[PDB]
Amino acid sequence: GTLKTSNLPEELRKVFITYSMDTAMEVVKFVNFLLVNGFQTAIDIFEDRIRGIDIIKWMERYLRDKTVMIIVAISPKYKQDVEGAESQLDEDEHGLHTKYIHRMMQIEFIKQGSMNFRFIPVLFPNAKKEHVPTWLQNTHVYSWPKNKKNILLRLLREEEFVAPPRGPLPTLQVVPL
Amino acid sequence: GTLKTSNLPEELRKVFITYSMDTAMEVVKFVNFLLVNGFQTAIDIFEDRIRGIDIIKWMERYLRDKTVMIIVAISPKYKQDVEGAESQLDEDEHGLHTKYIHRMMQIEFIKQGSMNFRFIPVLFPNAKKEHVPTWLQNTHVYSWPKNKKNILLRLLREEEFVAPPRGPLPTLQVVPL
Amino acid sequence: TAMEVVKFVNFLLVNGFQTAIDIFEDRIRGIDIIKWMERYLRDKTVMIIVAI
Amino acid sequence: GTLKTSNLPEELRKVFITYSMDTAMEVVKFVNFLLVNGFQTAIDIFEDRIRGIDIIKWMERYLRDKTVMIIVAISPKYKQDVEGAESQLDEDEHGLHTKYIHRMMQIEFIKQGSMNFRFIPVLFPNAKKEHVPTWLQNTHVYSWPKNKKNILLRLLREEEFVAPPRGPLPTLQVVPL
Amino acid sequence: GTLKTSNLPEELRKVFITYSMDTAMEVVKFVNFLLVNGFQTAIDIFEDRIRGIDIIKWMERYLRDKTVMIIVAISPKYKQDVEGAESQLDEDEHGLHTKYIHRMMQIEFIKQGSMNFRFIPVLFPNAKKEHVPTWLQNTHVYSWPKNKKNILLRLLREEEFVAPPRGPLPTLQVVPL
Amino acid sequence: AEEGALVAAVEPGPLADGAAVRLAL
């Protein structure tokens, strides 16, 4: 029917992505897909020049800002990272940064009363529902690219289904028998 | 006939719907029917944005409330889910949530002495009377779209038949013989 | 015999008898049908009319 | 006399017992009597583990199974439970579960046309005829321990009296006068 | 009588306790009681040094492990925390951690098909039946210190009543009349 | 007493349905 263009302010178009290396190949395509659709996706590979100045400050900028939506790229190596990067993975720097980001996300999630407002889990092709960290299983989980339109709708903060406006209570007629 | 207007307070117009995915389309039609007739129907597909924050909290918000009328959409897959959603299927998330809701309803039903105050089973086009869980067979089972008028009456909490006020006992005349 | 039963219930109610029938007690009967029936079956003082 | 053995398959040797707390002691002896005689009796005090996993699922396992014979242990507190555990007992949990089981049995009984195929009422030493629910008075009512032999015969599904095979009609001899 | 000893492996002697501040004083006695009976109870107040390193990692240690039996210390403030910890308080850290633990337990419970394998609700003296979260009311609820021996039996995974071994079906003797 | 006080059946007079929409991007 009639077309609709979201009035989403550019402030709410910021998106931050955290991932593991195994899924980086598809994460590049995912970032391209988001950029084509007009979202300002911040990821380490493309933000490298600014990120190089101070990695920790770069991460903290997106972690502090409540309005920034964070997309979690779920892969078999993501759970392994956020669980045992320091010891099990021969001290992988990217794994350590991913684990730190995950810990910050969990701390914020707990502080909010275990309510998730801006962390979006996404299942990449080589992932499975078991790989999603438990606290992230309490919300919507999107498979990529299976549910890409749903991901776009979520980032737009739009409902896939729009309920009709609630009407008035029906009037009742009384007919003698 | 004469027209009667319901006094149903807006607080008593909340409705929650639990269903299985085999009847999703008819559930959407049913939700439209309820919304247009002035009932505030809470369903996962339409409250997706709020439901995403905390799914379990969202469900418990309606399960706690004694004043919310829960409509049970009965279909072949509903019984299947509430019986073996975890074992008979490859971990269907919606099936597991439906099973949890059914368990909470049963627990509340038992704690109340096995009296059903707010759970309304509704049979959908492909459903049979055998698909209704046994404890729900002890109440009025409606059929959709056959009894939609009766469903509206039940939600309005109105009687389909107005019993006239009880009169006085008749006076007896005595005649000799 | 539903229609004639409705007329009969009208006749009884008008004359001052509290007739319990399923169609009019729908609200209470919906809570627990079997309990609703047993309430009238137990009570020895409730007269049961059998509409043949 | 002569010896006979039954072909009763093990699948038909399952028994489920529903009782009230006042009978608990005698019910323990009754369960010992059944188990020793080769019957697989399910009771809440012996299946504490599986029942603890999920109480309602545990009850439904035997309620839904048509082949399981249910033994109703009647006593003064059993009728009180199944009629008023709702409020009279300050939330007596066992009373509430007993009431739920009784309601499910009644629903099955009515749905089958008021024919009782697997509910076996048993009177316990402190019980009387008045304590049996009315719908259960339409079948054989056994008394414990007075009729325990008869109870075993009932569970074995073996008639107590062997009727001799029907013979042929007698031959008529005419001796005219 | 006779004495028995359980073959319970040490790895199965680990118990995790979650509670609220009002039960803190009683929880100390409960933990001492558990420790004296040889159970390795993990609680924040005692494992302070390890918990201090990383609170969230510490909690996830006992949440991930399927073999760890979690004891839930119910009380008026426990339900208050697991419902409105974030809002009704001036950011009570213990309340928020309790809420997070409760959410993880619920997610596991739902994901398992609404079956409770290792969550053991225990009612502390100032608690009531109503303070038990609904989904925890579908299992055995132990009161403390009233049912402490039942709690020990549950932890040992030993049924209080042991059914006698099932015998053979009785033989049938036929006698003429 | 005369049965003029008849029983009356109640029905909802006005009703409407539909108007559900789905976004397709």
Contact (CB<8Å) F3/C6:
no
Q: Which residues from chain E sit within 8 angstroms of residue A112, using beta carbons?
A: 86
What is the spatial distance between Cα E105 and Cα E107, in angstroms, rounded to a whole number?
A: 5
Closest residue in B to D108 (Cα) is: B134
Task: Report how far apart the first and last C-alpha atoms of chain C are (Å, whole number).
Answer: 8
B152 CB near a chain F CB, below 8 Å?
Answer: yes
Q: Where are the alpha helices (DSSP H) in A41-92?
A: 48-53, 55-64, 76-88
Tell me how far apart the alpha carbons of residues D169 and D64 are, in angstroms, rounded to a whole number: 46
Question: Based on the number of CB atoms within 10 Å of its own CB, is C47 exposed (0-12), middle (13-18) or buried (19 or more)?
Answer: exposed
User: What are the tokens at A129?
Assistant: 């529902």
Q: Which helix (H) or strand (E) holds C27?
A: helix C26-29
Closest-CA residue of C relative to D135 is: C38
Closest Cα in chain C, distance from residue B11 (Å): 20
Decide if B162 and F7 are in contact by the 8 Å CB cutoff: yes
Q: Pick E86's closest partner by Cβ from A106, A112, A138.
A: A112
Q: Is the dihedral of CA B124, B127, B130, B131 positive or negative?
A: negative
* CA–CA distance, A88 with A86 (Å, rounded to integer): 6
Best mutation target, E123, E129, E161, E173, to test chain D (most D CBs within 10 A): E161
Q: Mark whether E and A touch (3+ CB pairs within 8 Å).
A: yes
- Tell me the chain C residues in contact with residue D134 when contact means C-beta distances shorter than 8 Å: 38, 41
In a 10 Å sphere around its CB, with 0-12 CB exposed, 13-18 middle and 19+ buried, how is residue E9 labelled? Answer: exposed
Closest approach of chain C CAs to the CA of D156, in angstroms?
32
Q: Is residue D127 a contact partner of residue D74, using CB atoms and an 8 Å limit?
A: yes
How close F25 comes to chain B (CA, Å)?
A: 17
- Give CA–CA dist B6/A170, Å, rounded: 8
Q: Report the residue count for chain F.
A: 25
Which residues face A142 on adjacent strands?
Answer: A122
Q: Alpha-carbon distance A12 to A155, whole Å?
A: 9
Contact C34 D110 (CB under 8 A): yes
Cα(E32)–Cα(D9) distance, integer angstroms: 51
Give the residue on C whose Cα is nearest the Cα of D103.
Answer: C34
Torsion over CA of E113, E117, E122 and E127, rounded to 10 degrees? 0
CB contact under 8 A, E110 and B91: no
A113 with E99: Cβ contact below 8 A: yes
Mode of pairing for the β-strands spanning F21-22 and A161-162: antiparallel
Find the residue in C nearest to B162 (Cα).
C24
Give counts: helices (H), strands (E), chain D. 6, 6
Distance from CA of B146 to the nearest CA of E (A): 33
- Taking an 8 Å cut-off on Cβ atoms, the answer to whether A134 and E96 are in contact is no
Asked whether the beta carbons of A66 and A117 are under 8 A apart, the reply is: yes
- Please name the member of C13, C14, C27 whose beta carbon is closest to the beta carbon of B159: C27
Interface touch B138/D103, C-beta < 8 Å: yes
Exposed e or buried b for every residue in E53-84, given b needs 16+ CB within 10 A? eeebebbbbbbeeeebbbbbbbbbbbbbbbbe
Concatenate the DSSP letters of all residues of E4-43 into one string: ------GGG-EEEEE--GGGHHHHHHHHHHHHHTT-EEE-
Q: Do A113 and E56 touch (CB under 8 A)?
A: no
DSSP E51: H
Residues of E in contact with B85 (CB under 8 A): 113
Q: Are A147 and A141 in contact (CB under 8 A)?
A: no
3-state secondary structure of E73: strand
Name the experiment that determined this structure. Answer: cryo-EM
User: Hey, which bits of chain A come out as E strands?
Assistant: 14-18, 40-42, 69-74, 119-123, 142-143, 161-162, 172-176
| Cβ(D139)–Cβ(D116) below 8 Å | yes
Partners of B4 in beta bridges: A172
**C2 close to F (CB below 8 A):** no
Instruction: Determine contact, residues E59/E100, Cβ cutoff 8 Å.
Output: yes
Helices (H), ranges, chain E:
24-36, 48-53, 55-64, 76-84, 93-111, 148-156
Question: What DSSP designation does D140 have?
Answer: -
Q: What is the DSSP letter of D103?
A: H
Chains near F with 3+ CB pairs less than 8 A apart are A, B, C
What is the distance in angstroms between the Cα of D76 and the nearest Cα belonging to chain C?
A: 17
Torsion of CA E28, E31, E37, E42, to 10 degrees: -150
DSSP code for D65: -
CA–CA dist D21, D28 (Å, integer): 11
* CB-CB under 8 Å, B170 with C15: yes
- Burial bucket for residue C15 (CB in 10 Å: 0-12, 13-18, 19+): middle
Dihedral pair phi/psi, residue A17, rounded to 5° = -120, 135
Find which of B45, B54, B56, B93 to mutate to test the A interface (most A CBs within 10 Å of its CB).
B54
